[PDB]
Design a binder for this molecule. Structure first.
Ligand SMILES: NC(=O)C1=CN([C@@H]2O[C@H](COP(=O)(O)OP(=O)(O)OC[C@H]3O[C@@H](n4cnc5c(N)ncnc54)[C@H](OP(=O)(O)O)[C@@H]3O)[C@@H](O)[C@H]2O)C=CC1
Ligand SMILES: NC(=O)C1=CN([C@@H]2O[C@H](COP(=O)(O)OP(=O)(O)OC[C@H]3O[C@@H](n4cnc5c(N)ncnc54)[C@H](OP(=O)(O)O)[C@@H]3O)[C@@H](O)[C@H]2O)C=CC1
Ligand SMILES: C#CCN(Cc1ccc2[nH]c(N)nc(=O)c2c1)c1ccc(C(=O)N[C@@H](CCC(=O)O)C(=O)O)cc1
Ligand SMILES: C#CCN(Cc1ccc2[nH]c(N)nc(=O)c2c1)c1ccc(C(=O)N[C@@H](CCC(=O)O)C(=O)O)cc1
Ligand SMILES: Nc1nc(=O)c2nc(CNc3ccc(C(=O)N[C@@H](CCC(=O)O)C(=O)O)cc3)cnc2[nH]1
Ligand SMILES: Nc1nc(=O)c2nc(CNc3ccc(C(=O)N[C@@H](CCC(=O)O)C(=O)O)cc3)cnc2[nH]1
Ligand SMILES: O=c1ccn([C@H]2C[C@H](O)[C@@H](COP(=O)(O)O)O2)c(=O)[nH]1
Ligand SMILES: O=c1ccn([C@H]2C[C@H](O)[C@@H](COP(=O)(O)O)O2)c(=O)[nH]1
Lengths: 498, 498
């Protein structure tokens, strides 16, 4: 009785223009499409429409090792005679009729629907599952997919793949669904035990391969297995202390789809980190006001620096990066020469001695803290190159703010890793996340509660444009980037704690 | 009709003396001895010898919610309690004759035999499984256990507990034994897994809950999933970059059992980080030579310090902890007063502002590296207290030598945590391990793997002696400790890549 439907698709439901597919041969999909419809472990049926049949290459088009059926009225038998095992290709008046052709039951064990209108037909019971490549890079189409919701901003999600990429296209794969020895030793497992938790992320999606879940389940654990603590601000925290998330970069770039990340500013801050700016005023008016609230006249006073020109973060972050150990004067002082340029070495090292185990970047100088707007959240990282000339990053963070900053802070260093990857002449492998007191604020509860009701969407690609004018990490300029096929959910307003 | 035994013994197989039990009430065992023997998710039987019966206080004697059978010819008639009143008591002649009580077979699911004399005749033919509370201390005994091979230096494992403890007694729990749609989901998992000799720590131990496994498994993955690299020394490693481990402290200290830890030096070294000495000729002189290797005349001349007194580690770990950023003169130089006393701030904060997120200890001072014998491995740590006045630690190691140093490293910063927990007046919970490039030298390939065969033994518990006289971190003296119930296998010995 039951059937399945293979579809690749632009997020707005496009499938095929001028009789074809609009994306350049994406190959990790062609794997997927093959090794689904071909398998019963170690033949199946593939039922397409007349025009679906046409969009195929002549040598390819007897779809191999599975029976084909074509819902057509004009053609029938001019098809073959066009030349082992390979089944005589059939033509069935309609799709309910394709099903009737069952003379065939037992001789096939899975039927797979590879056409628009034919798709509408399938919906008008039949199926149960819908194998769907989520393509995120949009293209123009004419033939669009029919009416379950998300993909853009019932058949329930049961699988999310981890986002891949070929020839400029980010896309993940999804699955929609219609809606003694061993035991003798449980007596003891029984008592050391406590079991279900049950404020968890996305339950009905069983296979959870989209890397973002680390984060979403990092939320759950926090409220589930965290403790309700005081902190500086006056706004209640729920903390675990010490977690971890590592992400793939070698395909798609890890910008949180769950809610519109603030890209813009994580880029603008990195530069500001690459530059060595300590004047947060240089940020503010470029539209990035995240640090505006940590240097206010009213705040530097409550940080015991009455001696600071509102904005000055002092020897904070990147200052410690490029000028370590120096006597910092003011956010107008040209510091070019003073202090260790940690960051200078990392790249010098990486391009000559990649096997070194001294590729770090410490923003924690104890002989400072009471001079900065605030002592550093993300305080240290490390770089590494293995067999495949692939760069990889670890960053260590004292205080991670999951509702708000983490999302941000995530890209920041992933983005950076790309930065470093390129300058050193490499292809970027993995960023990883090591966190101190890991917590969420109390007014972040209800809002995060709701973010948990969102499916992760395929990650974007982030490109370095102008790779050939870029030779060093400064040659990077707020323009040399392309945030592609990024398909976010809606932003969630979560208040910052001063 | 095979069965299970309820043991609770010392490493040499000692079980009871002068008719009692030789260890002070151990409660986490008593529960364990309760829950096991009456179960199979919706009674059982407990069979014992005459004196094994006279052990119990009469209030305990009727072992409630189970069947009690006592093989003995002397005792025939009793009553000490004699209501529901389900229990029913029964006396026997011999064990094979208690078995011969199957009436009963329906009324009871499994029988458990709880001592000596009856233990040795239960083997000498039925049985199958052995519920054994490995007790890590020895005590004076007379009534021992029969003929063991894994209490000290068939019945194969399956399950290892995680070392608990009551009243100064560490002990593991172990088990020995005789010798609807997701079908849709499969097609895709299939191909993704498609690369798929993998060696593995004790695979005949299914439940692996001891904790040391993290490390043993840490080995497996390293050779299994790591890269063949050239490193500084010219030895060659297999490395993964980015691993972790976090160990239970509030019951037992995580001193490694698979191979004898070189405890002795670990204690001394930390104190020598607590003292901050740089002259390794002090260390050498108490019989610890792990560091005398990287401070030879030839090594500092290979570190282009022609001006360093064979030993002087430079402004290394300890120096960076107690006197930060300060001009370092020599390994004799009294520096008392210079720089930042990172550590002193930590306790200071912890006794006052525990909810702080500024309780750290950085030894990565990049304005130093060119001076020291080596740039710091265990570079950063962090202190945290939840609302349960419990401490916790993260340390961050840039580089890790799994074979030799890691075990060593493990104790150090655990041992530390205990100190910090006691001095701040707290009860320690957990240490956590964050490692960068994590690698095993290629000449450790074989030694390790032979370590892989060894069972973890229950962890030891470590005590601070002279808790009263100890008021600050300095008040610690190389003798204010005892290692209790540590039962390692022999040390393997793995060369150090100079
Ligand atoms: N990205 C992806 O996953 C996919 C990409 N594509 C693309 O889509 C485009 C073509 O799709 P589409 O225009 O919808 O063409 P179809 O493959 O759906 O074929 C249409 C024709 O098939 C017959 N047919 C289809 N449905 C019915 C029906 N319900 N009842 C009776 N006959 C039916 C008719 O044939 P007749 O006129 O002879 O009577 C009809 O003209 C191409 O550009 C193609 O490459 C195609 C498949 C999937
Ligand atoms: N740590 C633990 O897990 C355990 C602790 N213990 C301790 O062990 C000690 C007592 O053990 P143990 O000395 O060995 O005494 P037992 O419990 O084995 O009892 C011995 C008596 O039971 C009868 N009996 C036992 N075995 C046989 C046999 N094979 N054939 C015929 N009769 C048999 C005889 O009784 P009779 O003379 O009347 O004919 C015999 O004298 C105590 O100190 C007790 O507390 C006891 C249980 C387990
Ligand atoms: C991490 C980091 C760097 N930082 C610095 C920074 C400084 C103090 C902090 N304080 C606290 N308590 N939490 C933080 O996350 C935090 C972050 C950030 C600061 C703000 C936003 C932020 O407000 N994001 C919002 C709105 C931004 C916008 O659109 O203008 C959002 O879109 O969700 C992001 C990053
Ligand atoms: C980590 C750390 C601190 N250190 C410092 C230290 C310095 C340089 C290093 N270099 C390398 N390549 N690996 C290390 O583990 C290492 C460790 C240690 C050094 C040696 C031993 C060691 O030799 N342990 C042996 C034998 C000791 C003995 O004689 O008893 C053992 O018993 O296993 C342990 C710790
Ligand atoms: N996910 C998905 N991706 C697609 O490309 C796709 N294409 C169609 C129709 N278009 C085409 C065009 C060419 C081939 C094709 O040549 N198929 C080969 C793949 C070669 C390989 O094994 O890599 C095949 O034999 O299956 C298939 C479908 C229908 N559903 C789809 N569904
Ligand atoms: N693992 C193990 N631990 C033991 O202490 C033990 N003891 C015996 C015999 N000694 C004793 C002495 C007293 C009680 C007793 O009072 N039993 C109570 C436990 C109380 C509780 O539930 O906490 C019982 O009702 O089972 C049991 C065994 C046999 N096998 C053992 N096996
Ligand atoms: O890059 C950053 C910078 C700041 N914070 C958040 C984490 C803490 O919740 C908050 C307050 O800083 P402290 O009170 O921990 O200094 O800032 C981040 O998460 N990431
Ligand atoms: O506390 C320590 C000190 C040293 N090492 C080992 C790790 C490296 O294998 C080795 C060499 O140091 P670098 O070449 O990475 O500096 O020392 C540790 O694992 N832990």
């Amino acid at each position: 009785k039951p059937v399945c439907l293979v579809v690749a698709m632009t997020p707005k439901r496009g499938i095929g223009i001028n009789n074809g597919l609009p994306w350049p041969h994406l190959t990790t999909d062609f794997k997927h499409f093959s090794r689904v419809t071909k398998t019963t472990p170690e033949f199946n049926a593939v039922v397409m429409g007349r025009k679906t049949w046409e969009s195929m290459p002549r040598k390819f088009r007897p779809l191999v090792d599975r029976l084909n059926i074509v819902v057509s009225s004009s053609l029938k038998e001019e098809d073959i005679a066009a030349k082992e095992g390979q089944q005589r290709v059939r033509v069935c008046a309609s799709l309910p009729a394709a099903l009737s052709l069952e003379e065939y039951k037992d001789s096939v064990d899975q039927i797979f629907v590879v056409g628009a209108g034919l798709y509408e037909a399938a919906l008008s019971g039949v199926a149960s599952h819908l194998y769907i490549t989520r393509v995120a890079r949009e293209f123009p189409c004419d033939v669009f997919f029919p009416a379950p919701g998300d993909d853009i901003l019932t058949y329930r999600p049961i699988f999310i793949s981890k986002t891949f990429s070929d020839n400029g296209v980010p896309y993940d794969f999804v699955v929609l669904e219609k809606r003694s020895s061993a035991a003798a030793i449980a007596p003891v497992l029984a008592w050391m035990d406590e079991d279900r938790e049950l404020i968890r992320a996305v339950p009905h999606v069983h296979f959870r391969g989209h890397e973002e879940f680390q984060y979403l389940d990092l939320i759950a654990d926090i409220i589930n297995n965290g403790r309700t603590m005081d902190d500086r601000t006056g706004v209640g925290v729920i903390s675990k202390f010490g977690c971890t998330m590592r992400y793939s970069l070698d395909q798609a770039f890890p910008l949180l789809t769950t809610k519109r990340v603030f890209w813009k500013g994580v880029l603008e801050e990195l530069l500001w980190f690459i530059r060595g700016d300590t004047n947060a005023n240089h940020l503010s008016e470029k539209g990035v006001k995240i640090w505006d609230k940590n240097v206010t006249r009213e705040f530097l006073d409550s940080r015991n620096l009455p001696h600071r020109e509102v904005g000055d973060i002092g020897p904070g972050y990147g200052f410690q990066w490029r000028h370590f150990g120096a006597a910092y004067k003011d956010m107008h002082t040209d510091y070019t020469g003073q202090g260790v340029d940690q960051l200078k070495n990392v790249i010098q090292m990486l391009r000559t001695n990649p096997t070194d185990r001294r590729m770090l970047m410490t923003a924690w100088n104890p002989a400072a803290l009471d001079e900065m707007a605030l002592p550093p959240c993300h305080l240290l990282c490390q770089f590494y190159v293995n067999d495949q000339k692939e760069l990889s990053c670890i960053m260590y963070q004292r205080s991670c703010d999951v509702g708000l900053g983490v999302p941000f802070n995530i890209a920041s260093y992933s983005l950076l890793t790309l930065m470093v990857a390129h300058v050193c002449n490499l292809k970027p492998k993995e960023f990883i996340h090591f966190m101190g007191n890991t917590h969420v604020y109390t007014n972040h509860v209800e809002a995060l509660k709701e973010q948990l009701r969102r499916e992760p969407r395929p990650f974007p690609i982030v490109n370095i444009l102008n790779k050939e004018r870029i030779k060093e990490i400064d040659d990077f300029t707020a323009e040399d980037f392309e945030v592609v096929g990024y398909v976010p959910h809606g932003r969630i307003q979560m208040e910052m704690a001063v």
